[PDB]
Design a protein around this ligand. Structure first.
Ligand SMILES: CCCC[C@H](NC(=O)[C@H](C)NC(=O)[C@H](CCC(=O)O)NC(=O)[C@H](Cc1ccccc1)NC[C@H](CC(C)C)NC(=O)[C@@H](NC(=O)[C@@H](N)CCCNC(N)=[NH2+])C(C)C)C(N)=O
Lengths: 99, 99
């Protein structure tokens, strides 16, 4: 599909057995999901953006479906203002920017 | 062009007649440039990012060239981690996400 940018590019994702809406973010290196109780081990890390840093839990090899496209990779979980799909997963679903 | 996302989608911009590098950011509503002298009038506002809110200067109707495509619109100037081209100008250059 093709997504125009008149409004925020939000799509449905499936992660941890839950459906969520998430923002496709070419300006995000990483994928950040709003606080949810994902199982298993994780690593504390801090991520940066506008406004400063926040503390997140880094989970590896998490299964995630993005607009119907399966992906698997590192997902960061914590108090983000939006679920964000970043380049680490956008590359796996073959997303490009075009103009 | 078509831009893949294995690296940050950085392009050349011209603003105030000066060349800069900026990130194409589909997760940004607005366009935010590092502190610079810029011709035109401005007003102070607040914008939020992943880590919190910052003060920026809002300039309207600013000419900006992005990867050799013309845009004219609102540019926010302030202490951002990166120059960012957001949806307000990505729509002007006809950018879409594709997968
Ligand atoms: C796995 C190792 C991680 C290492 C870690 N990496 C990072 O921190 C990397 C560089 N950060 C980033 O890439 C982060 C996303 C988080 C992430 O991917 O990790 N990107 C970002 O935060 C980029 C800007 C940026 C680019 C490059 C560098 C820094 C910053 N913007 C993304 C962000 C998405 C939004 C949901 C918060 N957009 C914005 O912040 C834009 N804001 C807006 O559009 C506002 N109008 C919305 C207000 C909020 N309101 C609300 N929810 N009601 C702003 C740029 C105008 C590190 N460096 O410590």
């Amino acid at each position: 599909p093709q997504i125009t940018l008149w409004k925020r590019p939000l799509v449905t994702i499936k992660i941890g057995g839950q459906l969520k809406e998430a923002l496709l973010d070419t300006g995000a290196d990483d994928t950040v999901i709003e606080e949810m109780s994902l199982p298993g081990r994780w690593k504390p890390i801090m991520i940066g953006g506008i406004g400063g840093f926040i503390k997140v839990r880094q989970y590896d090899q998490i299964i995630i479906e993005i607009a119907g496209h399966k992906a698997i990779g590192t997902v960061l979980v914590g108090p983000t203002p939006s679920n964000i799909i970043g380049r680490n997963l956008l590359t796996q679903i073959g997303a490009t920017l075009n103009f």
